[PDB]
Amino acid sequence: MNLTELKNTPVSELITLGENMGLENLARMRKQDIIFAILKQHAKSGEDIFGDGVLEILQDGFGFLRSADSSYLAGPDDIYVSPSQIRRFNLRTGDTISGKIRPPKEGERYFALLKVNEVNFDKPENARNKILFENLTPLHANSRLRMERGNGSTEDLTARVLDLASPIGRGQRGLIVAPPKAGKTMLLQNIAQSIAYNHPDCVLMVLLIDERPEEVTEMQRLVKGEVVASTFDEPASRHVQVAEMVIEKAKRLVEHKKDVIILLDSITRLARAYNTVVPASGKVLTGGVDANALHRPKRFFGAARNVEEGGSLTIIATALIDTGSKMDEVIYEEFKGTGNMELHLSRKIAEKRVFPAIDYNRSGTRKEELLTTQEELQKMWILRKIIHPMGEIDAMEFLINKLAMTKTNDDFFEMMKRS
Amino acid sequence: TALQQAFDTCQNNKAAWLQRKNELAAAEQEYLRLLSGEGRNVSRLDELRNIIEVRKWQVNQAAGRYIRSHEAVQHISIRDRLNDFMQQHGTALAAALAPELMGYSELTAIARNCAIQRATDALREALLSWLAKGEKINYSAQDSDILTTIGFRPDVASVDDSREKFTPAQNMIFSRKSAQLASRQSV
Ligand SMILES: Nc1ncnc2c1ncn2[C@@H]1O[C@H](COP(=O)(O)OP(=O)(O)OP(O)(O)=S)[C@@H](O)[C@H]1O
Numbered sequence: 181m182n183l184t185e186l187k188n189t190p191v192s193e194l195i196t197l198g199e200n201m202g203l204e205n206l207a208r209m210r211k212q213d214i215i216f217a218i219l220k221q222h223a224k225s226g227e228d229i230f231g232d233g234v235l236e237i238l239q240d241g242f243g244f245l246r247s248a249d250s251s252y253l254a255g256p257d258d259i260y261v262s263p264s265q266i267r268r269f270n271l272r273t274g275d276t277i278s279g280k281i282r283p284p285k286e287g288e289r290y291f292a293l294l295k296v297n298e299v300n301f302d303k304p305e306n307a308r309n310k311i312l313f314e315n316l317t318p319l320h321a322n323s324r325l326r327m328e329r330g331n332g333s334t335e336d337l338t339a340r341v342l343d344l345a346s347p348i349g350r351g352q353r354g355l356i357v358a359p360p361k362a363g364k365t366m367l368l369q370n371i372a373q374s375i376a377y378n379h380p381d382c383v384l385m386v387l388l389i390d391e392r393p394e395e396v397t398e399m400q401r402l403v404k405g406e407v408v409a410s411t412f413d414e415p416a417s418r419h420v421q422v423a424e425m426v427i428e429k430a431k432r433l434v435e436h437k438k439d440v441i442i443l444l445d446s447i448t449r450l451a452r453a454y455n456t457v458v459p460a461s462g463k464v465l466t467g468g469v470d471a472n473a474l475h476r477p478k479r480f481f482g483a484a485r486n487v488e489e490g491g492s493l494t495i496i497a498t499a500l501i502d503t504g505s506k507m508d509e510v511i512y513e514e515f516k517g518t519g520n521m522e523l524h525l526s527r528k529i530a531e532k533r534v535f536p537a538i539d540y541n542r543s544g545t546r547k548e549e550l551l552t553t554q555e556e557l558q559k560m561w562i563l564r565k566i567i568h569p570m571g572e573i574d575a576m577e578f579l580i581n582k583l584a585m586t587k588t589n590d591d592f593f594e595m596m597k598r599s
Numbered sequence: 600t601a602l603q604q605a606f607d608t609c610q611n612n613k614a615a616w617l618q619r620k621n622e623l624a625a626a627e628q629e630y631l632r633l634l635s636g637e638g639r640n641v642s643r644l645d646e647l648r649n650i651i652e653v654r655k656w657q658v659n660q661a662a663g664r665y666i667r668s669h670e671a672v673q674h675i676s677i678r679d680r681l682n683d684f685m686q687q688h689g690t691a692l693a694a695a696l697a698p699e700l701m702g703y704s705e706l707t708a709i710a711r712n713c714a715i716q717r718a719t720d721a722l723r724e725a726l727l728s729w730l731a732k733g734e735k736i737n738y739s740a741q742d743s744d745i746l747t748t749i750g751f752r753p754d755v756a757s758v759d760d761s762r763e764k765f766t767p768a769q770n771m772i773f774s775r776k777s778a779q780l781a782s783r784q785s786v
């Protein structure tokens with residue numbers, strides 16, 4: 181009765197299976213309640229199964245275990261993690277644990293864990309000795325990331341545009357500044373499915389906070405990689421705890437020399453959520469924001485780096501622009517200069533609906549020499565010198581027109597050099 | 600062996616295109632009947648208009664793919680007929696084309712190209728003279744039935760329905776709309 185197949189299948193399958201062996205009417209409980217129940221009665225027959233999840237530690241020494249598909253929401257599906265497990269298997273937050281579970285005994289109301297058999301998709305025994313985060317040394321983004329397919333669709337054209345505008349490498353720190361209706365949705369899509377179709381080896385995650393339910397539900401069926409989100413319906417405490425849990429799990433994953441890429445939406449919303457949840461420090465600056473509120477998102481965004489011995493944590497994030505709220509530019513100015521590169525978008529470009537609305541001139545990168553070769557970098561500065569004279573939007577139509585008929589940017593290079 | 604697979608691809612594409620046209624015609628007649636009816640349900644009118652748009656886009660796509668399949672079939676047949684005709688009469692062609700075809704292997708790229716164009720317009724003039732002679736042309740015996748079934752040119756309904764051109768963004772949004780519409784209609 182593994183929760184994986186009881187959770188991925190729709191609620192109709194769950195209620196059908198519940199009616200198969202005779203639970204009380206299932207059309208009144210919640211997904212977490214339904215799975216907790218059905219697993220309890222189906223496990224009372226006498227057999228045992230595996231169990232997968234991610235563990236966190238609350239204020240007390242006792243710990244809980246959550247599931248990824250449940251959007252990191254606490255509930256009856258949570259599995260106990262006794263502190264004895266923390267000592268005997270050096271367990272910490274954010275580790276993916278798979279092992280034998282225990283049915284809820286009398287006096288206990290959540291699920292229990294018996295034995296551990298797979299910690300961070302690896303044997304727990306050989307993972308006892310591990311290098312922790314504090315002694316890791318960062319490195320410049322060296323491995324170039326590919327987001328181009330060459331098929332030639334509008335999504336492919338946008339991917340080529342963003343590839344040529346600024347390089348993206350493994351273990352970098354990037355920002356995507358864009359006001360609303362600038363196409364942030366299908367851009368973030370473009371990155372997601374492009375790196376999914378180009379780099380299946382590295383795991384893909386997308387965290388989303390306070391978006392509309394339709395956007396997140398069309399996210400769940402668009403990206404092949406797992407996506408975690410919490411809309412604006414939940415309070416800010418849910419958002420901040422989801423963000424901290426997922427970022428610490430990503431840090432634990434990259435500690436295993438595994439490449440991880442993060443699509444972050446949005447730094448402004450995160451900062452607002454922490455400001456609402458953090459106690460006041462007595463020093464409030466312009467916009468109703470105190471100093472300690474932005475300190476958590478500072479290290480949240482600063483966790484991106486390239487690991488020396490192996491693995492790379494790349495983080496690309498978006499920020500709200502000129503929305504009319506005075507704290508947005510406060511977080512804007514606070515987060516400027518802390519990223520390896522930034523990509524700018526404008527409104528006047530999208531008024532004429534020139535997609536994407538990226539700003540080539542404002543776009544830039546730090547230390548391009550190490551990330552790419554000199555030949556392609558020079559084949560980039562030539563476009564830079566071509567694009568500086570005329571306007572940004574005119575350069576947009578120029579580039580999309582003279583890149584549309586060309587299958588790939590590589591062929592585009594020789595097609596334009598002769599001109 | 601590609602001749603038979605191309606022929607069946609073309610015929611099933613034509614059948615699917617016929618399916619698309621009669622589905623679109625049924626949708627159009629239903630929409631017209633509901634417009635003429637006393638019923639004033641605006642939601643039905645809007646959803647039928649969406650049906651009409653999706654069906655006409657599907658008909659255009661079917662016509663385009665049928666045309667491209669027909670062109671591919673014709674190209675394959677022409678290539679095969681040219682191949683076996685030249686395998687039969689290569690010496691006969693080369694005897695006439697010798698004055699500007701000697702030493703093709705040792706000729707440089709530009710000389711090869713100029714000789715190619717000289718033979719090209721020479722045979723162009725020869726074909727013009729043959730057409731001026733005016734004898735009716737018959738299909739090859741080996742590939743008679745397939746070409747007769749396919750025909751020299753596709754149906755006019757295929758070519759007049761492809762007049763409108765759709766940008767890739769419109770094509771992709773139409774694809775999503777058709778997918779969701781079919782998913783909802785199946786249920
Ligand atoms: N590459 C693209 N291909 C097709 N449509 C695009 C493309 N880029 C933008 N659009 C259109 O741009 C419009 C607005 O895009 P959105 O993603 O909704 O804007 P946004 O930046 O995400 O901000 P929001 O979601 O409105 S708050 C939609 O109608 C899209 O169809």
Ligand SMILES: [Mg+2]
Nearest residue numbers: 363364365366
């Ligand atoms: Mg959006």
